[PDB]
Design an enzyme around this catalytic site. Structure first.
Site, mmCIF file in Angstrom:
data_model
loop_
_atom_site.group_PDB
_atom_site.id
_atom_site.type_symbol
_atom_site.label_atom_id
_atom_site.label_comp_id
_atom_site.label_asym_id
_atom_site.label_seq_id
_atom_site.Cartn_x
_atom_site.Cartn_y
_atom_site.Cartn_z
ATOM 1 N N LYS A 1 -8.868 11.212 42.821
ATOM 2 C CA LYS A 1 -9.748 11.898 41.894
ATOM 3 C C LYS A 1 -10.380 10.856 40.983
ATOM 4 O O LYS A 1 -9.718 9.916 40.542
ATOM 5 C CB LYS A 1 -8.970 12.951 41.090
ATOM 6 C CG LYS A 1 -9.829 13.859 40.242
ATOM 7 C CD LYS A 1 -9.032 15.063 39.713
ATOM 8 C CE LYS A 1 -9.088 16.252 40.673
ATOM 9 N NZ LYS A 1 -8.987 17.568 39.955
ATOM 10 N N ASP B 1 -17.931 -3.114 40.980
ATOM 11 C CA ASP B 1 -16.620 -2.575 40.643
ATOM 12 C C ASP B 1 -15.582 -3.095 41.619
ATOM 13 O O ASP B 1 -14.678 -2.364 42.039
ATOM 14 C CB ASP B 1 -16.645 -1.037 40.592
ATOM 15 C CG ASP B 1 -15.415 -0.430 39.901
ATOM 16 O OD1 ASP B 1 -14.646 -1.145 39.206
ATOM 17 O OD2 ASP B 1 -15.197 0.784 40.102
HETATM 18 O O1 LIG Z 1 -14.983 5.846 48.229
HETATM 19 C C1 LIG Z 1 -13.889 6.045 47.810
HETATM 20 O O2 LIG Z 1 -13.715 6.198 46.459
HETATM 21 C C2 LIG Z 1 -12.471 6.521 45.907
HETATM 22 C C3 LIG Z 1 -12.310 6.737 44.498
HETATM 23 C C4 LIG Z 1 -11.054 7.075 43.981
HETATM 24 O O3 LIG Z 1 -10.876 7.279 42.605
HETATM 25 C C5 LIG Z 1 -9.946 7.185 44.828
HETATM 26 C C6 LIG Z 1 -10.102 6.974 46.193
HETATM 27 C C7 LIG Z 1 -11.370 6.646 46.732
HETATM 28 C C8 LIG Z 1 -11.515 6.428 48.154
HETATM 29 O O4 LIG Z 1 -10.581 6.461 49.154
HETATM 30 C C9 LIG Z 1 -11.199 6.194 50.354
HETATM 31 C C10 LIG Z 1 -10.635 6.118 51.648
HETATM 32 C C11 LIG Z 1 -11.458 5.821 52.708
HETATM 33 O O5 LIG Z 1 -10.877 5.752 53.970
HETATM 34 C C12 LIG Z 1 -12.829 5.595 52.512
HETATM 35 C C13 LIG Z 1 -13.394 5.678 51.236
HETATM 36 C C14 LIG Z 1 -12.547 5.981 50.135
HETATM 37 C C15 LIG Z 1 -12.758 6.132 48.698
#
Ligand SMILES: O=c1oc2cc(O)ccc2c2oc3cc(O)ccc3c12
EC number: 2.7.11.23
Length: 346
Positions: free
Chosen positions: A33, A153
């Site tokens: 989240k 980031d």
């Molecule tokens: O884009 C992301 O932003 C996030 C932001 C957060 O706060 C937590 C997790 C994610 C996150 O987990 C992933 C797993 C994948 O396999 C590919 C993309 C993401 C992706």
């Protein structure tokens, strides 16, 4: 009632495990989240594979930023095709019940989880070298002139293992990214990985990701953030502890120079003095990267004595690459093509 009962009171889609979308996606679980919205694990029935779906908040400002994210990801895979530059791949985007949804490849855990699994002992310098080489290649791809993408980031959480056993990685989450010609935010990067030029309110370019990378690579081998500031003033002071005072020709152009430093009547900059009677930061440049890495004493914790790829010569090469990445001057800070030519990788 929001969005016909589908949203909570904070523009987030109320995730229910097992729900089926568009006769295709079976929502499995929440995996993260954030301020943009949510990320869920889902099974794509049509392609027969797991995916991660970013569900952007049902709210215009977040929709518009994610529309930029989508455009940048689409630009990247127009120039990647074979997915050989360690960038997450956008598989699809669509609107579903007033949420922009971004479908990504499923990946393993992130580099911070790996560190926590070592109980913050850090990973070996050999694995750090592999990560560094893939990240510099990813940054070279971002620096391709048609792209010129600043991630903005980079941190351990935004670098994911492809498979829990292999060393291959991918950069994820371009939700804050911009092209060099289209910068729009000033308060960017997570604080531990934030570049001096961003801390200083100066215009920034792709070199700020190289700064984050340098900080990330040290943390990956020591297990601990290099510059763990609690706020912007503390962050710059921890930077200065290791790297000294920034060059005058930088601070003389720095909109926030006087947030951290004072100009002496004779032109030379010093730190603003800490408040009477409290313990001072270590003097500028005296928290040596040489001793943080344990260059001569068996690496972090002294755990690496006699280990291959951890000779004093190896540690000296790593230290040199890091200092090139942590150059205060974004014009002279090492660039991806030349970091790849560094003897650390030979
Ligand atoms: O884009 C992301 O932003 C996030 C932001 C957060 O706060 C937590 C997790 C994610 C996150 O987990 C992933 C797993 C994948 O396999 C590919 C993309 C993401 C992706």
């Amino acid at each position: 009632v929001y969005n016909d009962g589908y949203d909570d009171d904070n523009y987030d889609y109320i995730v229910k495990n097992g729900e089926k979308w568009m006769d295709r996606y079976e929502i499995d679980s929440l995996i993260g989240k954030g301020s943009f919205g949510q990320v869920v694990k889902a099974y794509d029935r049509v392609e027969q594979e797991w995916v991660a779906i970013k569900i952007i908040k049902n709210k215009k400002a977040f929709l518009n930023q994610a529309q930029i994210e989508v455009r940048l990801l689409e630009l990247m895979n127009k120039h990647d095709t074979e997915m050989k530059y360690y960038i997450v791949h956008l598989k699809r985007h669509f609107m579903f019940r007033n949420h922009l949804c971004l479908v990504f490849e499923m990946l393993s855990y992130n580099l911070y989880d790996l560190l926590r699994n070592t109980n913050f002992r850090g990973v070996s310098l050999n694995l750090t070298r592999k990560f560094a080489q893939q990240m510099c290649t990813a940054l070279l791809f971002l620096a391709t002139p048609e792209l010129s993408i600043i991630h903005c980031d980079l941190k351990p959480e935004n670098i994911l293992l492809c498979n829990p056993k292999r060393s291959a990685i991918k950069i994820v989450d371009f939700g804050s990214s911009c092209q060099l010609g289209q910068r729009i935010y000033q308060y960017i990067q997570s604080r531990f990985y934030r570049s001096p030029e961003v801390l200083l309110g100066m215009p920034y370019d792709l070199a700020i990701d190289m700064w984050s990378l340098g900080c990330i690579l040290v943390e990956m081998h020591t297990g601990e953030p290099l510059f763990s500031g609690a706020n912007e003033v503390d962050q710059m002071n921890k930077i200065v502890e290791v790297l000294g005072i920034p060059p005058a020709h930088i601070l003389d152009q720095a909109p926030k120079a006087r947030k951290f430093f004072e100009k002496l009547p004779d032109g030379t900059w010093n730190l603003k003095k800490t408040k009477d009677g409290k313990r001072e930061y270590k003097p500028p440049g005296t928290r040596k990267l040489h001793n943080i890495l344990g260059v001569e004493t068996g690496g972090p914790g002294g755990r690496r004595a006699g280990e291959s790829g951890h000779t004093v010569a190896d540690y000296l090469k790593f230290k040199d690459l890091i200092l090139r990445m942590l150059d205060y001057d974004p014009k002279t800070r090492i660039q991806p093509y030349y970091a790849l030519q560094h003897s650390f990788f030979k």
